[PDB]
Amino acid sequence: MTILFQLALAALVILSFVMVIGVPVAYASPQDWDRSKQLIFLGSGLWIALVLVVGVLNFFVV
Amino acid sequence: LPEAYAIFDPLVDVLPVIPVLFLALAFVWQAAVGFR
Amino acid sequence: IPLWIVATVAGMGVIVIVGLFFYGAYAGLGSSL
């Protein structure tokens, strides 16, 4: 249980750090970005999942 | 904090200062464009 | 070398050396401890 909880929590932090830098760069980006609302939609939907996952796996570890 | 979240104790002691960095970030961006 | 990079780096360096001093006020000499 803890095996999945901390992984999903550590990945949530790492993903966020990518999103924190990635999202504003992708927006202010002239060319190069049909490329990237996929990855915006990628991380976003994946971010919400991890939040719920860690939120659910919280009651099983504490 | 719960013992399961004792991992991010150094991270927690940093988070409150983050909003202030946004005020400083505005000056970086403005310096980057040369204060138009 | 862009000036805004120089000013930012120097600026961050200023904050660090100052934060060390306020740190020093709570540890070692002048800590009242």
């Binding site: 750090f17 924190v20 830098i21 504003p24 760069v25 927006y27 202010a28 980006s29 002239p30 190069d32 | 150094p10 991270l11 002691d13 940093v14 200062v17 983050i18 960095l21 946004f22 400083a24 970030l25 970086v28 961006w29 980057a32 464009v33 | 862009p2 990079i5 930012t8 961050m12």
Partner: peptide, 29 residues
Amino acid sequence: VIAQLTMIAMIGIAGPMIIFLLAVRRGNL
């Protein structure tokens, strides 16, 4: 103990890095 200092490092540089990336990419700054 200096994990302290590692956090403010990545977090603190996260801001200016975006500006640097948008500069070399010549983005909408």
